[PDB]
């Protein structure tokens, strides 16, 4: 948590006006009025990393929901677990009227 | 004594010089910051001369026919970069070379 908080601090202390000179703008003969088609490439990466670091708990929650809902059905969806005599015997024992 | 500490970076030395240049014209009043600033300047100039002499001795006594292998140099460059920008170097990256 300390490492993650430090990284988020560093990301948030960046400037907003964070254009990037791409060295391929040579072939795009910019005339001081046009807009470079790659000014926002480091800004987009900074935003992506920051937001992904801020949505960590949401990913954790969805992951644990997926894991729980796929584990609860192990004995019904996985063949070598569903076909052992012990799991079959237990599932039969539950249904004894 | 007072013993103003050694400047950590070059900006600190620049601000030391600025402070000295501001203080100069009131020596009978300050009389104590000037001496510490000048001792620091003496130490810095001494270190610079020693560094120049050691660099001269180093560059003229390197080796006759030694060379650096490219693989190791590339690994060292990448590791230096990673360590410089606070990322992590995997454990199998330096012990094995």
């Amino acid at each position: 948590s300390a490492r993650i908080s430090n990284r988020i601090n560093e990301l948030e202390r960046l400037p907003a006006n964070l254009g990037t000179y791409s060295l391929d703008d040579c072939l795009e003969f910019i005339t001081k009025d046009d807009l470079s088609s790659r000014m926002d490439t480091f800004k987009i990466k900074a935003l992506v990393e920051l937001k992904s670091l801020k949505l960590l708990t949401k990913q954790k929650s969805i992951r644990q929901k997926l894991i729980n809902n796929v584990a609860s059905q192990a004995h019904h969806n996985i063949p070598y677990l569903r076909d052992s005599p012990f799991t079959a015997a237990a599932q039969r024992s539950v249904q004894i009227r | 004594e007072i013993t103003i500490p050694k400047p950590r970076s070059s900006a600190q030395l620049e601000q030391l010089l600025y402070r000295y240049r501001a203080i100069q014209n009131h020596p009978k009043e300050n009389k104590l910051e000037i001496k510490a600033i000048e001792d620091t300047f003496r130490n810095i100039s001494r270190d610079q001369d020693i560094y120049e002499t050691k660099l001269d001795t180093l560059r003229k006594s390197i080796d006759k026919g030694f060379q650096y292998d490219e693989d190791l140099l590339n690994k060292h460059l990448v590791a230096l970069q990673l360590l410089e920008k606070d990322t992590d170097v995997p454990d199998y990256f330096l012990d094995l070379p």
Binding site: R3, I4, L53, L56 | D88
Partner: peptide, 13 residues
């Protein structure tokens, strides 16, 4: 599938 946290988990352990 997004390696959001892998670097820090790896460097701490």
């Amino acid at each position: 599938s997004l390696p959001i946290e892998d670097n820090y988990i790896r460097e701490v352990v």
